[PDB]
Amino acid sequence: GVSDVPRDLEVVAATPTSLLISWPPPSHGYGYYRITYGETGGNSPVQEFTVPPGKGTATISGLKPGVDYTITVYAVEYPYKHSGYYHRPISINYRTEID
Amino acid sequence: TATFHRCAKDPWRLPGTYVVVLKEETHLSQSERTARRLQAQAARRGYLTKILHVFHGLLPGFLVKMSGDLLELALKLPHVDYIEEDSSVFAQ
Amino acid sequence: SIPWNLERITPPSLVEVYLLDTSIQSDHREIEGRVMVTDFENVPEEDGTRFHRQASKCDSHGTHLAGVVSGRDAGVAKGASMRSLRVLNCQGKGTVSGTLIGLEFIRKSQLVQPVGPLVVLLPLAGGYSRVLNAACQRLARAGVVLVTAAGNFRDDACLYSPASAPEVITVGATNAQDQPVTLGTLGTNFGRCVDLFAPGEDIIGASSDCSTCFVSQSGTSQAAAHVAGIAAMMLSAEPELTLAELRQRLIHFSAKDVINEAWFPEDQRVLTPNLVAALPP
């Protein structure tokens, strides 16, 4: 049914404004991964976008240089922001580089 | 005089389908009479309408597929309490 | 070991539960022989859509919830018998009009069926609807127990329907740590329109993948399904309970002042009930 969330989220690359995350794609994906991101310790409001699990990767752009960010991935059947979710979320912490 | 109601969240609105709700103190056959009357009046003005459902037992009224241009006309119909534009619901 | 959510609602006769929702897998071991798929269908989609979607049968949401209410191994009331009405499509979408016609179908079925207790689960939400709130009120007046999801908008349940209907038991979601549930950038709704909270995060229940599969799901839909199960248990023992008598018992037996009100906006903390549903002992 709805694809499980990755066992680990890999930070592949990081520029002062961008973050690149990767995961082994599942064999037969269904439906979406909701990628949520925000500044660790709620200085800013949390942002999101949905991505098919099969893409194996996603780029988080427009970030502030040198700040610690938390990325949470949710397995979802429906992409609208008010849907429920499947399985458990997976979180990662990443500090972006300075200018 | 009857009121028009719609969804405050604009992307959830479904214009073109309306629930015409009638006053509780009416006859059972009054829902069908008003639906038929709305259809006749709209046809005179060159508008096609479809009656999707007639409500009994829950609340008195009907479900109509018509142009929003006819709401002014529809709000003037006797026994009408209010008219609601259909909207979306979602699994939570 | 029992699942956390069934531990939480545990303290230290011919009830029918109507579900309005997606299509369900009625041959799943959890609910087999106790769920009937009615002929009711009113959805915004073409009839054949769910046969040409290679991906699924569009029954994951409905099956899980039927499992949460009445599932043999993971349900609240293992008893219950259930009646399924299809009002949510392949995209998880329905209409206010289709939900009305469904409630009207339930009223007609109540008049035909012998005098007995009736629970209606509406695990869906849209914007505040004058007509949907009126239909719910009329059904409640007829002695029907209606249970709805508070909504997953991290907002005031007053802006949502059936959530905002006072004659409906509106259920928010809490987790294993007695915290309100975060869903994406959103989560459980709050405010004066929420009647109580129930387990709604990491809820194990029937998966439509296969007849013996289980999956964990989170949302106010799961929270509402716990309360529909609790109400079905309560009515199985006391079939003559009023909606006011049942609501009174839910509030009375619930766990109190256990939710961290810090997750809610400051102005909403006093307005949100700090109650987590539980069964009578």
Swiss-Prot record, chain B:
Instruction: Spell out the residue numbers of the propeptide.
Output: 1-92
Q: In which tissues is it expressed?
A: Expressed in neuro-epithelioma, colon carcinoma, hepatic and pancreatic cell lines, and in Schwann cells.
The entry's localization annotation reads: Cytoplasm; Secreted; Endosome; Lysosome
In this protein, which residues make up the domain named Inhibitor I9?
17-89
Task: Explain the post-translational modification.
Answer: Cleavage by furin and PCSK5 generates a truncated inactive protein that is unable to induce LDLR degradation.
Q: Which family does it belong to?
A: Belongs to the peptidase S8 family.
Q: What does this protein do?
A: Crucial player in the regulation of plasma cholesterol homeostasis. Binds to low-density lipid receptor family members: low density lipoprotein receptor (LDLR), very low density lipoprotein receptor (VLDLR), apolipoprotein E receptor (LRP1/APOER) and apolipoprotein receptor 2 (LRP8/APOER2), and promotes their degradation in intracellular acidic compartments. Acts via a non-proteolytic mechanism to enhance the degradation of the hepatic LDLR through a clathrin LDLRAP1/ARH-mediated pathway.
Quote the disease note of the record. Hypercholesterolemia, familial, 3: A form of hypercholesterolemia, a disorder of lipoprotein metabolism characterized by elevated serum low-density lipoprotein (LDL) cholesterol levels, which result in excess deposition of cholesterol in tissues and leads to xanthelasma, xanthomas, accelerated atherosclerosis and increased risk of premature coronary heart disease. FHCL3 inheritance is autosomal dominant.
What is recorded about the domains?
The C-terminal domain (CRD) is essential for the LDLR-binding and degrading activities. The catalytic domain is responsible for mediating its self-association.
Quaternary state and partners of this protein?
Answer: Monomer. Can self-associate to form dimers and higher multimers which may have increased LDLR degrading activity. The precursor protein but not the mature protein may form multimers. Interacts with APOB, VLDLR, LRP8/APOER2 and BACE1. The full-length immature form (pro-PCSK9) interacts with SCNN1A, SCNN1B and SCNN1G. The pro-PCSK9 form (via C-terminal domain) interacts with LDLR. Interacts (via the C-terminal domain) with ANXA2 (via repeat Annexin 1); the interaction inhibits the degradation of LDLR.
* Stated name of the protein: Proprotein convertase subtilisin/kexin type 9
What taxonomic ancestry is recorded?
Eukaryota, Metazoa, Chordata, Craniata, Vertebrata
Gene field: PCSK9
Span within the entire protein? 61 to 152 of 692
